[PDB]
Amino acid sequence: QDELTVRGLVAALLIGFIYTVIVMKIALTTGLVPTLNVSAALLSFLALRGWTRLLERFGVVSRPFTRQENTIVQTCGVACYTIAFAGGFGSTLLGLNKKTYELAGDSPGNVPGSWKEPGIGWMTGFLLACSFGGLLTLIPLRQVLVVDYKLVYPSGTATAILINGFHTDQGDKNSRKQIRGFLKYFGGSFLWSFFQWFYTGGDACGFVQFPTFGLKAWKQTFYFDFSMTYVGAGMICPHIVNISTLLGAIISWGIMWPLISKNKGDWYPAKVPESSMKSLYGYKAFICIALIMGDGMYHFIKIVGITAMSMYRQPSWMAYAGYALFSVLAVVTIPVMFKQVKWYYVVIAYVVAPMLGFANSYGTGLTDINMGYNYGKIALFVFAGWAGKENGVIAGLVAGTLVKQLVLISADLMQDFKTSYLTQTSPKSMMIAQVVGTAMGCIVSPLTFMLFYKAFDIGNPDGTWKAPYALIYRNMAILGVEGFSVLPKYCIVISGGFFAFAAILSITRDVMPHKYAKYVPLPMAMAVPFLVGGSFAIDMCLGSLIVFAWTKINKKEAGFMVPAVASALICGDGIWTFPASILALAKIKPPICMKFLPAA
Amino acid sequence: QDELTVRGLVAALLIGFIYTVIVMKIALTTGLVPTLNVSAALLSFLALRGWTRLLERFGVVSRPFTRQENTIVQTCGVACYTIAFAGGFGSTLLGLNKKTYELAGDSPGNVPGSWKEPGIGWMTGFLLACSFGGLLTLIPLRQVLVVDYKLVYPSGTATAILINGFHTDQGDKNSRKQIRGFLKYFGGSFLWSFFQWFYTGGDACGFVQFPTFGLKAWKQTFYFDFSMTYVGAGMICPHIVNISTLLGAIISWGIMWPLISKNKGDWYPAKVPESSMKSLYGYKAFICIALIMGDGMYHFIKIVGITAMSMYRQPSWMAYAGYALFSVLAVVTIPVMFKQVKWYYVVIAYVVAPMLGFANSYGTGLTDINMGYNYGKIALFVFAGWAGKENGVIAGLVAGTLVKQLVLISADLMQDFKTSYLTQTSPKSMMIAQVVGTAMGCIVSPLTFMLFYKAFDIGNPDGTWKAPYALIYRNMAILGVEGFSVLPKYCIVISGGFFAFAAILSITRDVMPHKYAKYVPLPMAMAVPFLVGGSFAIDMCLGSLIVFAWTKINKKEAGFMVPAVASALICGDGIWTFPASILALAKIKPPICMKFLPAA
Ligand SMILES: CC(C)CCC[C@@H](C)[C@H]1CC[C@H]2[C@@H]3CC=C4C[C@@H](OC(=O)CCC(=O)O)CC[C@]4(C)[C@H]3CC[C@]12C
Ligand SMILES: CC(C)CCC[C@@H](C)[C@H]1CC[C@H]2[C@@H]3CC=C4C[C@@H](OC(=O)CCC(=O)O)CC[C@]4(C)[C@H]3CC[C@]12C
Ligand SMILES: CC(C)CCC[C@@H](C)[C@H]1CC[C@H]2[C@@H]3CC=C4C[C@@H](OC(=O)CCC(=O)O)CC[C@]4(C)[C@H]3CC[C@]12C
Ligand SMILES: CC(C)CCC[C@@H](C)[C@H]1CC[C@H]2[C@@H]3CC=C4C[C@@H](OC(=O)CCC(=O)O)CC[C@]4(C)[C@H]3CC[C@]12C
């Protein structure tokens, strides 16, 4: 009790509903889904405190609003609208339409019978079959990642400190300074993000696209964006993670991509545009996943090996028993909706999902970057190649959704579990909130999507309701119909080499003594700057430099003030994401565009 | 003794010589003469300390290098290169050439016999006749302005604190914090100015031309440039000065100029470009000088009235006796060089010079802005109208130089006297340094100018050595040949109205009780934003806002730390002016141009 409340369920439903509308409409118009996890924590506090104070004003007495209750409300609210974008409503499930089929055009794999129309009944059934699969895998993941590996989730840590500060009324020698120090940088970060908004009024202009080291380095993604989220995240991360991130940027963007791009006419065709698996993006996706798989497989096998040895020498199996039940339920249900999907396609997806989900959850616990979109695109490509021209596009799209959603749900909610750990929230109550929130998400989102779908015209390339990613994901399946031959030359060989390189580094860190194991780079921390630019790496290294400078200047103060200052920078930028979404919701666009030119 | 040293004279000659070359070449190529007063103080310290330490390394003993000696060296050095730009070598004396005469073209007033060629003999004689006139007027001005009126010269105050910090080795509870606090902001301001340099690579782009309130307000000069000099200057100025500066910007740029510009076809011709006395710049120059004259005349008359009453009831006259001697020497000498100039033209110039010099020196003591260039342009216009088409262009140019130089010398060296006051430097030793420095300036500058003039081609509009202001000043004289009829409609009436308005405000402040005299705006502080934009006013108000916020937060700390922090911001930007000049000297230009566009 005192954590699961009726008022909390009502507040979570309201927050989950309004956030679903914001996420859905933005996805159906621009496709740039914002991260609104931090804003939900603030809205949960304001809504419930206002309700309690309203009762106080009228004389009605209510139960005290504690920090554990606030975490549960955010947890239920987050899972409600997470399905809105993790379910592929604007990316993959929208790519099954006949409208998207016609936009793709006449091409191999795009057979006349590979289009599906949206509907409330099948979408709700599709989500319920697969949404409750990731939740069961989370229970074993919480122990190994949050409490055993002690991974720091910067978004989870920042939200936990924010939630604690709201409910911390104790007067201590440090508590007062923690809150006041948090407020000074929270307001500054929010105003800084608010100020930047007026000058990001075009393609690649603003403080985000600032060439701090010149235009030549900026085009190589080696600039410094003024993002306090990445600076704040890097402050609470260990230096080895921040250094490893810089190495990945230098190896990929400073060495590898310039060298590989020198063969734009020999290795891969030059007529095809970039950002496609046939041209220079095959290297981006496959090498990046190779590093994570090379490191993720070693860790996952080691955990199984340790567990196997412990049992041989002698609720963990309860979660997997329930996971198998939902896995079978999905296997018997999904091919009924889609004749294209075969029964064993779903079995393979569910078998490798805990492994893929573990890798992304582990990666999110180091660099605060959720790479579940990359896994869905890779899973879409391989599954599309597992079927011929017939029943291939739908097979890739549907199988991609299962992998994309389960992996995204895992990483997103692991940070939410990190918040519960720091706020002394009961894990069993957290499990109930996610199940209730996910169940409502599987009902609200299909209803919300159909309300937009029926009222407006979605998918028109020359209209307000344009979904660019619906066609992009459709083209990935069409290109994925053909096998691995479409990948550029030496793409598999280099990926296999980096798989070995990732494997060697993982082994090297656990075999060498602890003295020399503090300097081995992390293979999957280096993998993040392979898809995103090196600007993220520079920001993380700046955060470590600030902590390194602060620690030397004042060892005592930096011990307890760095988490508070780092959280304020993350929260302040995170809070502004809600007004920025509303401005984007109301078609209000930035007035000015701060462009940089080479003294033309 | 201990202030006038042989090593100081040698160092001042070297600093004065190198600064003359930098000022002369920049004036002959771009015309944007930098303010290098702060950089001279640092170079004086480094040069002499290195000389003393070199003697220490070799075992040679030397007299201790004190703060008074440092002030004298900067004083002699500043006066040496001040004549380089205050003498109109690149603006007015270059406008007398036959090359400039041909560029002006066929127009009334530009008679065939109104060109003069440069020469070492007459230029040296011309300067010696008029350069030592302003110095004598300074001696009475020091008492009334520096010590009696207690005007704060932000550049003089900042240099004095910088010079004191170099020679302050005492260990006190506050002295250590004063120096360390100065160093933190001095390095930050220097790096900030250094960082901005790479992005100001074009016409109106960079952090200086930042539309902090939108593009509409920026075109109205109501933006916030990131200039730490103006922010630092406003911190040590009283709030009434900073508020009055904002009022002048709102009245002129927010009300007057938009309304007057609405008559671009009726009041003044629209074909003629702006920034000319015939179109919208007559209002800028005449109204701005009207406010200063309205306030300056009241103060100057009051000082004479107080002095007259004191004598009636009963070295001041020594300075004026010497000033009259040089005034007569100029009168008998200048018309010999120029047949165009008549004897009584010089007499009128020297009679009104102490009045004009007092007004600019008083204005420089409030807003740290030297407006002697405006007086020279106004003096050029009226004196050109005092002669017909014959002997009119030369009469305006020559008479403009006397007014421009004497007024510029007064304001520039009054800040130097403010430095001596705070550094406990002997005023009589300061007088000797200025005379020696001015005498060398009248010799080095004509030699330096002729070295460039003989070696290269100066005045070519399509060459590296282009002097835009030489022709602009030439056109002012040609337009000034015709009388006050060329001024736009109602220009004199509005200027006369603001003359009364300035007079009323000056009287109102001294007649009302001290309780209500703290809120009367200063007429000549409002006059500064009439020529420059309102961005300067905003920066000054930001500095007052910082002090107002700092004082409320910590009354004790803001008492002694504000001058140190304000000086560091001014000095840091001032020091960078020297490397920026060297980069401009070596034809090195900024790489990037940070342009702002309306989301085109
Ligand atoms: C003490 C700390 C704060 C150091 C400050 C960081 C410097 C190492 C950075 C800041 C500005 C940077 C410069 C910003 C811009 C350029 C322009 C760039 O020239 C271009 O190529 C621009 C486009 C073009 O000219 O074609 C060359 C690198 C350079 C000098 C960068 C080099 C590295 C600099 C000096
Ligand atoms: C200390 C922390 C806070 C970050 C500071 C990093 C920068 C000072 C340095 C480190 C890595 C450097 C980069 C390392 C590698 C490259 C690759 C190089 O790319 C190419 O070789 C061009 C290839 C082509 O022509 O396409 C251009 C310089 C650049 C961007 C360097 C620019 C300056 C960077 C970003
Ligand atoms: C708490 C403190 C820090 C307040 C922050 C200052 C605000 C009062 C300033 C900062 C940004 C300013 C905005 C910056 C840019 C614009 C664009 C401007 O639109 C334009 O006209 C741009 C050119 C065009 O669109 O044609 C309208 C004013 C506005 C909203 C400005 C209004 C005033 C703002 C919000
Ligand atoms: C508080 C301190 C630190 C300075 C902050 C000042 C700004 C918040 C305000 C004060 C004065 C304002 C200005 C007052 C007057 C005008 C005149 C107005 O000009 C016109 O009427 C346009 C004329 C034309 O169309 O040519 C445009 C708005 C502007 C620039 C305002 C923009 C916003 C300003 C700069």
Residue numbers in the entry:
A (entry chain B), B (entry chain A): 46 to 359, 393 to 678
Task: Pull text from the paper.
Poaceae species use a unique chelation strategy, whereby plants secrete a high-affinity metal chelator, known as phytosiderophores (mugineic acids), and reabsorb the iron-phytosiderophore complex by the yellow stripe 1/yellow stripe 1-like (YS1/YSL) transporter for efficient uptake of iron from the soil. HvYS1 comprises two distinct domains: a substrate-binding YS core and a scaffold domain, implicating an elevator-like transport.
The cryo-EM map was reconstructed to an overall resolution of 2.9 Å with an imposed C2 symmetry. The N- and C-halves in the scaffold domain are pinned through a disulfide bond between Cys250 and Cys671. The scaffold domains from each protomer comprise the dimer interface with a buried surface area of 936 Å2. Each protomer’s C-terminal β -strands (S1s) form an anti-parallel β-sheet to assemble the dimer. In addition, a cluster of the hydrophobic residues including Phe240 and Tyr244 on TM4, Phe252 and Phe255 in the TM4–H4 loop, Phe271 in the H4–H5 loop, Met672 and Phe674 on S1, pack together to stabilize the dimer. The side chain of Tyr451 in the apo structure points inside to occupy the Fe(III)–DMA binding site.
